[PDB]
Design a protein around this ligand. Structure first.
Ligand SMILES: *[C@@H]1O[C@H](CO)[C@@H](O[C@@H]2O[C@H](CO)[C@@H](O)[C@H](O)[C@H]2NC(C)=O)[C@H](O)[C@H]1NC(C)=O
Ligand SMILES: *[C@@H]1O[C@H](CO)[C@@H](O[C@@H]2O[C@H](CO)[C@@H](O)[C@H](O)[C@H]2NC(C)=O)[C@H](O)[C@H]1NC(C)=O
Ligand SMILES: *[C@@H]1O[C@H](CO)[C@@H](O[C@@H]2O[C@H](CO)[C@@H](O)[C@H](O)[C@H]2NC(C)=O)[C@H](O)[C@H]1NC(C)=O
Ligand SMILES: *[C@@H]1O[C@H](CO)[C@@H](O[C@@H]2O[C@H](CO)[C@@H](O)[C@H](O)[C@H]2NC(C)=O)[C@H](O)[C@H]1NC(C)=O
Ligand SMILES: *[C@@H]1O[C@H](CO)[C@@H](O)[C@H](O)[C@H]1NC(C)=O
Lengths: 310, 228, 71
């Protein structure tokens, strides 16, 4: 699920006129289009940080996994943080990170990837060591086999079914998580959504930049050419034409960014709901947290998004 | 009953005081109002732009210039103002879509938290949901989510099952806990120990397969009746 | 009073090794606050460790009725 876009900013004066000061003098005749565009882009930028804040910062305690990693035969090494890595990322998180690749700036996000990884590690430790109790109050520790027995009891299967087949269930879970690692590694189109987000932002910026080399009906694309090769009285007309064309281009870019931001916000709200209802508890809603009767989910951070293991 | 009533009353009073004592509590509704006012103000301020014409007043353009070029100047002003008004309408449509999404969420919250009890986690407030109470606000709604929060936990020793007479007993709805010497069964969300009997436990197989099973006796309610 | 961040150069604020909740977000994990003006790395939350073991359970012995708002 995508969560946030790239925070971008525009300098209206530098984009429209470059560094010709009399062009800026003429641009003052247009009023507050530049202020409008700056305001809209700033709103989008703060909305992205709000999206990440809503999705990931759901616990105010940074829980730590115990030093001994025995959980009744279940093997969480593929999703728990790896101290060997300098970035302290789990193998799945590391694979996800590797697999996703003029007046215009790209602002950095407020939360660094290390902080997002630390949130995901806290959520994993809380859901492994305390079940769903940490999402509804103080964290109450419970042995993992007993938690998984509770979760079978939640889907209409009695506890003895788990307690008599604990080894088989542990083996199936470990094999399944290994298969997840292999499948996510071998297939490139699995992460299509985040890559599409990145590609859309990059191509929008590229087209906006390429729009600077359009004549827009005037005789030249260079302001100083208009100045030198033409006398002022209709050089003003040419400058007005170029300015209004570039302003239209920037308006189009901002409008498309607003629509895409609305879509990304919808996706981020969905991701926050999925976290709250599948990770911090067990969901009875059909097909909301995977195909089958849901038991638990595990969050994994990805570039510009989040990955759930249902 | 009395303790729960007292806690509820104190919580309601605290909600009133917290709303009175925090300025940015209604920031979302204030943002709606501010966004609308600012958009209208920008639209009316934009009316004083020349858009490359000799003046921003139509009467001056008409009373100063010959119509053959007065029409060019008027075309400039008209197209600029029309573009600004289009921009206003487009941003209004986008904001309307956002408010539509928020209103759909509010309707869902009403139907699921106010008209019933919701099992969805964190949908109707933090904690286990008991009930919600709606309150009207300017351009919005305010929900008072009454929720149940556990407190004052205590460590115990637990076992998955009890082996008795070569049989394995499992709790019906509770969990096996030990205070150090004796074993009880209590429900999960509130410590209430009880004697382990055959009424609150069910048998399944022998005690050779379960890992962590412990030895204990299981009282039979029917034995003393026949002992007399 | 010159500090170098991933976002850029911040001039006029003191960097402190302490950590607080974010007040004025700067970017790349740096926040600013007025306590003069100080810059710091935001604190994700209060650290906590839960005593996991395979034969220990924690059961609540009381409860609290809580009321929250949502606008
Ligand atoms: C838990 O899973 C991990 C990963 O599958 C296991 O680590 C493997 O250990 C064997 C031998 O110890 C190595 O040959 C493999 O290369 C390891 N895997 C990786 C990805 O490095 C681990 O043995 C499993 N069990 C426990 C108790 O940790
Ligand atoms: C564990 O619980 C048992 C059952 O209540 C306790 O045994 C009773 O304890 C009370 C007071 O502690 C005495 O008045 C009773 O006479 C005891 N009855 C029996 C049959 O022993 C036991 O003391 C508890 N253990 C701990 C460490 O609290
Ligand atoms: C629970 O009870 C069973 C049966 O009384 C115990 O099983 C006996 O264990 C002893 C000691 O190892 C053996 O010498 C006997 O042969 C076992 N008998 C049977 C029928 O299996 C069991 O040990 C008890 N649980 C614990 C933890 O001691
Ligand atoms: C459960 O918690 C409540 C408070 O949430 C306790 O009630 C308090 O009890 C003390 C001593 O009896 C009184 O001084 C307080 O005024 C009570 N508070 C309220 C709000 O009534 C209660 O005693 C606790 N129960 C247990 C078993 O720990
Ligand atoms: C509990 O965990 C320890 C290691 O942390 C292990 O040696 C021990 O056997 C476990 N106990 C049970 C009953 O599984």
């Amino acid at each position: 699920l995508p969560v946030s876009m790239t925070k971008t900013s525009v300098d209206c004066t530098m984009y429209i006129c470059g560094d010709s000061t009399e062009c800026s003098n003429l641009l003052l005749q247009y009023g507050s289009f530049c202020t409008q565009l700056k305001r809209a882009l700033t709103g989008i930028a703060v909305e992205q940080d709000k999206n990440t804040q809503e999705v990931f910062a759901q616990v105010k305690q940074i829980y730590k996994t115990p030093p001994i990693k025995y959980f009744g035969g279940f093997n969480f090494s593929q999703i728990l943080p790896d101290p060997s890595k300098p970035s302290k990322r789990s193998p799945i998180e590391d694979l996800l990170f590797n697999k996703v690749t003029k007046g215009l700036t790209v602002l950095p996000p407020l939360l660094t990837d290390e902080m997002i990884a630390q949130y995901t590690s806290a959520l994993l430790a809380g859901t492994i060591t305390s079940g769903w109790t940490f999402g509804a109050g103080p964290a109450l520790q419970i042995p993992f086999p007993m938690q998984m027995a509770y979760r079978f009891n939640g889907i209409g299967v009695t506890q003895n079914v788990l307690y008599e087949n604990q080894k088989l269930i542990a083996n199936q879970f470990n094999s399944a998580i290994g298969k997840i690692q292999d499948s996510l590694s071998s297939t490139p189109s699995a992460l299509g959504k985040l890559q599409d987000v990145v590609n859309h932002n990059a191509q929008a910026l590229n087209t906006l930049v390429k729009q600077l080399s359009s004549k827009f009906g005037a005789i030249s694309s260079v302001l100083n050419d208009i100045f030198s090769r033409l006398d002022p009285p209709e050089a003003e007309v040419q400058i007005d034409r170029l300015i209004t064309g570039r302003l239209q281009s920037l308006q189009t870019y901002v409008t498309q960014q607003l629509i895409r931001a609305a879509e990304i916000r919808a996706s981020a709200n969905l991701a926050a709901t999925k976290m709250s209802e599948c990770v911090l508890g067990q969901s009875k809603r059909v097909d909301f947290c995977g195909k089958g009767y849901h038991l638990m989910s595990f969050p994994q951070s990805a570039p510009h998004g989040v990955v759930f293991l249902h | 009953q009395k303790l729960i009533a007292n806690q509820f009353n104190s919580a309601i009073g605290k909600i009133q005081d917290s709303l009175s004592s925090t300025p940015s509590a209604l920031g979302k509704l204030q943002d709606v109002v501010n966004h609308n006012a600012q958009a209208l103000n920008t639209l009316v301020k934009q009316l004083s732009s020349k858009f490359g014409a000799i003046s921003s007043v139509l009467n001056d353009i008409f009373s100063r210039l010959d119509p053959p070029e007065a029409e060019v100047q008027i075309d400039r002003l008209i197209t600029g103002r029309l573009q600004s008004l289009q921009t206003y309408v487009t941003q209004q449509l986008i904001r309307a879509a956002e408010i539509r999404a928020s209103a759909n969420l509010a309707a869902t919250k009403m139907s699921e938290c106010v008209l019933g009890q919701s099992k969805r986690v964190d949908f109707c407030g933090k904690g286990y949901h008991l009930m919600s109470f709606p309150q009207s606000a300017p351009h919005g709604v305010v929900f008072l989510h009454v929720t149940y929060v556990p407190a004052q936990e205590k460590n115990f020793t637990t076992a998955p099952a009890i082996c008795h007479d070569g049989k394995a007993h499992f709790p019906r709805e509770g969990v096996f806990v030990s205070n150090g010497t004796h074993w009880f069964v209590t429900q999960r969300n509130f410590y209430e120990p009880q004697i382990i009997t055959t009424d609150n436990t069910f048998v399944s197989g022998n005690c050779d397969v379960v890992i962590g099973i412990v030895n204990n006796t299981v009282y039979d309610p029917l034995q003393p009746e026949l002992d007399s | 009073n010159v500090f170098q961040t991933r976002a850029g150069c911040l001039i006029g604020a003191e960097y402190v090794n302490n950590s607080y909740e974010c007040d004025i977000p700067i970017g790349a994990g740096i926040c600013a606050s007025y306590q003069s003006i100080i810059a710091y790395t935001m604190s994700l939350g209060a650290e906590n460790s839960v005593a996991y073991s395979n034969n220990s359970i924690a059961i609540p012995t009381n409860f609290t009725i809580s009321v929250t708002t949502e606008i």
